Amino acid sequence: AGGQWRLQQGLAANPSGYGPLTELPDWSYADGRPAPPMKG
Amino acid sequence: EKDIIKMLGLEKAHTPQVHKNIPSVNAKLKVVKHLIRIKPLKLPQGLPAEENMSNTCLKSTGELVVQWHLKPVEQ
Amino acid sequence: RGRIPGRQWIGKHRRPRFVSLRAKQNMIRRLEIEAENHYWLSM
Amino acid sequence: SYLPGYVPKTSLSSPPWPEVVLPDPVEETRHHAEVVKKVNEMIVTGQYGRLFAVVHFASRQWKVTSEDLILIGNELDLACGERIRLEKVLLVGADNFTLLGKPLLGKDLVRVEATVIEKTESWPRIIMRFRKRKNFKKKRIVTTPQTVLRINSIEIAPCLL
Amino acid sequence: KKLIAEGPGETVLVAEEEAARVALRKLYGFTENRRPWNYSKPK
Amino acid sequence: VKCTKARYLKKKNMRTLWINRITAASQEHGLKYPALIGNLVKCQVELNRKVLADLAIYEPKTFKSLAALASRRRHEGFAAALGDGKEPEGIFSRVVQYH
Amino acid sequence: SSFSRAPQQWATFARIWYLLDGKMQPPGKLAAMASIRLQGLHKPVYHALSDCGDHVVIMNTRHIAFSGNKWEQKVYSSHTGYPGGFRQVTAAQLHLRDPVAIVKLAIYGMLPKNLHRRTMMERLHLFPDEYIPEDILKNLVEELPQPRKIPKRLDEYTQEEIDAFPRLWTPPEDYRL
Amino acid sequence: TYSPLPDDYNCNVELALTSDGRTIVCYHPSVDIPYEHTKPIPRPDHDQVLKTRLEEKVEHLEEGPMIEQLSKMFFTTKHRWYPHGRYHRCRKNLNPPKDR
Amino acid sequence: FKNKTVLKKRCKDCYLVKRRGRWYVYCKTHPRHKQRQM
Amino acid sequence: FREVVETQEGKTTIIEGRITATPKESPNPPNPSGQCPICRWNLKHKYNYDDVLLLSQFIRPHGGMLPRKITGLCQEEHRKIEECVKMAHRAGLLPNHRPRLPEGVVPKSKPQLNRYLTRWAPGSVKPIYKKGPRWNRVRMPVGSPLLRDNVCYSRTPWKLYH
Numbered sequence: 017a018g019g020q021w022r023l024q025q026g027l028a029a030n031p032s033g034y035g036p037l038t039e040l041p042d043w044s045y046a047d048g049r050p051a052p053p054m055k056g
Numbered sequence: 057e058k059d060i061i062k063m064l065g066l067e068k069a070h071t072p073q074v075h076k077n078i079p080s081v082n083a084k085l086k087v088v089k090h091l092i093r094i095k096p097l098k099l100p101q102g103l104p105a106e107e108n109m110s111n112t113c114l115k116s117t118g119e120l121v122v123q124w125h126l127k128p129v130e131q
Numbered sequence: 132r133g134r135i136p137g138r139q140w141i142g143k144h145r146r147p148r149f150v151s152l153r154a155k156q157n158m159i160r161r162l163e164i165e166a167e168n169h170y171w172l173s174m
Numbered sequence: 175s176y177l178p179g180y181v182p183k184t185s186l187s188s189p190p191w192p193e194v195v196l197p198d199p200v201e202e203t204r205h206h207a208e209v210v211k212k213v214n215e216m217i218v219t220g221q222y223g224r225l226f227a228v229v230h231f232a233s234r235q236w237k238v239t240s241e242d243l244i245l246i247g248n249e250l251d252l253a254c255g256e257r258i259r260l261e262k263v264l265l266v267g268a269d270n271f272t273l274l275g276k277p278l279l280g281k282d283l284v285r286v287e288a289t290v291i292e293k294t295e296s297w298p299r300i301i302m303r304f305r306k307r308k309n310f311k312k313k314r315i316v317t318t319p320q321t322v323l324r325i326n327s328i329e330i331a332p333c334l335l
Numbered sequence: 336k337k338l339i340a341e342g343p344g345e346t347v348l349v350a351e352e353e354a355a356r357v358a359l360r361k362l363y364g365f366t367e368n369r370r371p372w373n374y375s376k377p378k
Numbered sequence: 379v380k381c382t383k384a385r386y387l388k389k390k391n392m393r394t395l396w397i398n399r400i401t402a403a404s405q406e407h408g409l410k411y412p413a414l415i416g417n418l419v420k421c422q423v424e425l426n427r428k429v430l431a432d433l434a435i436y437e438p439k440t441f442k443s444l445a446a447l448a449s450r451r452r453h454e455g456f457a458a459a460l461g462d463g464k465e466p467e468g469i470f471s472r473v474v475q476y477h
Numbered sequence: 478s479s480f481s482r483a484p485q486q487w488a489t490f491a492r493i494w495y496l497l498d499g500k501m502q503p504p505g506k507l508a509a510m511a512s513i514r515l516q517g518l519h520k521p522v523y524h525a526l527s528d529c530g531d532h533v534v535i536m537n538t539r540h541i542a543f544s545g546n547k548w549e550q551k552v553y554s555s556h557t558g559y560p561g562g563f564r565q566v567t568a569a570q571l572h573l574r575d576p577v578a579i580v581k582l583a584i585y586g587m588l589p590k591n592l593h594r595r596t597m598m599e600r601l602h603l604f605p606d607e608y609i610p611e612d613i614l615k616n617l618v619e620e621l622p623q624p625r626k627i628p629k630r631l632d633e634y635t636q637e638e639i640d641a642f643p644r645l646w647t648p649p650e651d652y653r654l
Numbered sequence: 655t656y657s658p659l660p661d662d663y664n665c666n667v668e669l670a671l672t673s674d675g676r677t678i679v680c681y682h683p684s685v686d687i688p689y690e691h692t693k694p695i696p697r698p699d700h701d702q703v704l705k706t707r708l709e710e711k712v713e714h715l716e717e718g719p720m721i722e723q724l725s726k727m728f729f730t731t732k733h734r735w736y737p738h739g740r741y742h743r744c745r746k747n748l749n750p751p752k753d754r
Numbered sequence: 755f756k757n758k759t760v761l762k763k764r765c766k767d768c769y770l771v772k773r774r775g776r777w778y779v780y781c782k783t784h785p786r787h788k789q790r791q792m
Numbered sequence: 793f794r795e796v797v798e799t800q801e802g803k804t805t806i807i808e809g810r811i812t813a814t815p816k817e818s819p820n821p822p823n824p825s826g827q828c829p830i831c832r833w834n835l836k837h838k839y840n841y842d843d844v845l846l847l848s849q850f851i852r853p854h855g856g857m858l859p860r861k862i863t864g865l866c867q868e869e870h871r872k873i874e875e876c877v878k879m880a881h882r883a884g885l886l887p888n889h890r891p892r893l894p895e896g897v898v899p900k901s902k903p904q905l906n907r908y909l910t911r912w913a914p915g916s917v918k919p920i921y922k923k924g925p926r927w928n929r930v931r932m933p934v935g936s937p938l939l940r941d942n943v944c945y946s947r948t949p950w951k952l953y954h
């Protein structure tokens with residue numbers, strides 16, 4: 017749902033496509049050290 | 057038509073592919089034009105240079121941006 | 132009491148099929164996509 | 175007594191839904207500022223109890239709180255006992271106030287911490303394929319890796335406005 | 336004329352007892368949505 | 379074979395149950411499932427149906443706030459459609475641009 | 478809500494009594510509302526493997542209204558099982574024979590085709606002519622609004638509304654209307 | 655005076671946006687049942703030489719009447735009250751798992 | 755009455771009228787002209 | 793309007809006609825250029841059978857229909873109003889306008905069946921004993937096909953056959 021609206025606004029139709037919700041790191045260490053990059 | 061699709065490389069659906077706007081490629085596309093969606097490749101920021109060949113993103117609008125920060129615009 | 136002789140979708144007499152609004156809309160959408168493909172191949 | 179475009183009141187003269195008059199933008203902005211100020215004051219004073227958070231992790235959304243256990247069907251390449259921070263928070267909520275992200279909340283605004291407590295494999299899963307009258311029968315057994323995370327603290331900080 | 340607690344039940348007496356228990360929990364601070372125990376290390 | 383093939387139906391059944399529960403909550407709050415899902419997507423709120431059902435069951439006030447947000451977005455969209463397009467965008471109709 | 482486990486469960490899984498007035502209302506819409514309430518699809522805690530159904534009491538089933546010519550066109554058919562025992566009656570005849578049959582059949586048709594449908598029908602209550610037993614009236618909880626708005630007759634409109642509605646044409650003074 | 659939903663059944667919902675526009679703030683304090691919208695609790699309900707000797711006097715109805723009484727009492731059907739067999743009784747698990 | 759698909763007036767005395775959901779060509783001078791729509 | 797009075801005075805019947813007050817169209821129509829009252833008042837495609845305040849202005853006191861030439865309406869609006877008036881009569885929305893009954897004739901008791909959107913006469917149609925298959929289903933008509941052009945706020949168009 018909302019794929020056409022996302023396309024009109026300029027985003028990917030699937031929210032799991034390109035964007036901060038997918039490409040940002042999932043987790044990181046509590047001490048602040050960045051996590052290794054995701055394989056996907 | 058199956059063989060032309062295989063030659064074009066569109067074996068997987070919903071996967072963008074780049075081709076050259078030349079008469080031969082256009083003739084190949086004219087046979088499978090009822091199975092494909094064709095868009096022009098828009099380059100608002102130019103060709104990806106050697107340095108920024110890993111921060112490129114193809115948006116749904118057909119634009120290949122060379123900077124991808126994953127951050128909101130401050131404006 | 133309403134029977135279709137033989138198989139429904141093959142033969143001389145068949146069960147009638149009717150076009151739906153969503154089917155028409157889908158066909159129109161695909162026609163628009165192919166027209167845009169024609170325009171982009173025009174150049 | 176009848177301006178141009180007038181239609182006498184009939185069954186279909188007017189729409190079957192009541193008209194909606196949205197608030198003036200400036201007054202609504204002032205009201206929003208007041209609401210944000212009071213919610214931030216509540217956060218500063220600590221007038222909240224248990225917090226719940228809807229976060230994004232392992233390609234799915236988890237609604238968690240403190241002392242909760244989540245089983246992720248994937249190995250995170252971490253040793254047991256390590257503490258990590260879940261950086262993809264979409265919703266935070268309390269008894270009185272709820273904050274939503276578009277599509278994610280601020281890291282300074284919300285911080286969610288988990289601890290890896292167990293690394294195991296799932297119970298055996300059977301994949302059997304059988305085709306009738308074709309002498310086609312195959313069987314496979316699989317065991318997917320799994321990691322257990324315990325949510326330790328959902329801490330929010332005053333960062334609104 | 337100010338509500339302090341509400342309790343559900345199958346009978347009036349059970350509901351009143353549950354309401355009294357809820358009021359006691361609220362007064363003692365042992366609410367269900369209370370602040371979770373802080374297990375963070377002493378820093 | 380049934381155990382292998384039921385893994386596809388399990389997800390469909392879960393999604394159907396989530397849709398039914400979300401529809402029940404929306405009807406309780408005076409809205410509908412499409413008018414809730416679409417107007418929540420228009421607000422850049424990417425909450426899946428499982429989380430929405432969990433909120434409806436356990437966070438009635440949060441779900442009511444979400445329904446109010448969806449109704450406000452729907453009213454803003456109706457106002458924009460009725461207008462000629464010269465009107466400024468609504469407060470909740472703005473889209474946070476990413477890059 | 479700081480409730481104990483048993484009171485919380487009892488409150489969550491509880492039966493509610495709804496009242497629906499069938500005074501000049503579509504039997505199909507009444508049946509849809511009653512079916513939703515009986516199945517429990519109106520509850521966020523709904524599930525098939527549970528008893529989320531609620532009691533529904535429908536009044537004024539004798540005064541239902543059918544759109545169009547359904548009273549004469551709609552046919553209810555049945556078979557007694559014996560040879561020559563196939564009986565078809567019109568909606569009007571069925572309504573006269575049993576004033577609570579049309580709504581009951583509509584609800585039965587709209588309910589799921591499983592073993593829970595009989596329990597749902599048992600939980601359903603139908604009463605004509607605004608008469609409800611004292612127990613059923615006392616255990617009621619909520620009254621659902623009528624689906625179809627009842628139109629007003631010409632005599633129901635007030636003189637204020639009559640004056641508000643403007644005259645549209647000027648008849649000749651010599652006509653014999 | 656615009657309200658997306660009425661504020662008289664569950665909670666007073668107030669919606670706001672932060673200055674940057676990246677955060678939506680929802681303030682929802684619960685509503686309280688007013689005093690005027692409540693009913694009082696119905697607490698209110700001889701020369702006997704002999705004591706009030708009350709004994710349980712209820713004869714056991716047969717299967718049919720008993721099941722009919724139970725079905726009428728609980729608004730159910732007779733099949734639920736009808737018994738089952740040893741196969742199902744032994745198949746039933748006596749130690750089901752408990753979550754919380 | 756005679757069942758017909760296309761009702762026609764055999765004489766000027768015949769008149770058409772719709773009754774019971776069906777058309778009828780009635781006549782009085784020549785009753786044989788009476789026709790019923792099929 | 794005009795009224796006719798018959799008086800048998802002294803074995804001499806006298807027939808007389810008198811002129812009574814007549815209503816006039818409300819001043820300042822929104823659309824003076826319209827050729828019919830409906831289009832002058834912008835009621836085209838904006839009325840239904842339940843609009844008794846509109847239907848009663850074009851009907852006789854006994855429930856009949858006024859001539860199109862007298863009313864000034866066009867053929868389409870005349871037919872639409874006639875269908876709406878028939879539906880209103882069948883739904884009992886005009887209790888004051890009833891058929892004239894000869895003296896001494898009292899109608900027998902009849903069952904009461906509430907109805908609305910009645911297209912055909914109740915005593916003309918036959919029961920649908922055989923509905924037929926799905927591809928050849930015999931549908932029950934609801935409403936009037938002439939009102940298909942009315943404004944439809946809902947996305948789903950009016951279903952004229954159930």
Ligand code: FES
Nearest residue numbers: 828830831866869
């Ligand atoms: S109402 Fe305009 S032509 Fe008749």
Ligand SMILES: [K+]
Nearest residue numbers: 136137141142
């Ligand atoms: K055939």
Ligand SMILES: [Mg+2]
Nearest residue numbers: 135136137138
């Ligand atoms: Mg066959």
Ligand SMILES: [Zn+2]
Nearest residue numbers: 765768781787
């Ligand atoms: Zn003749």
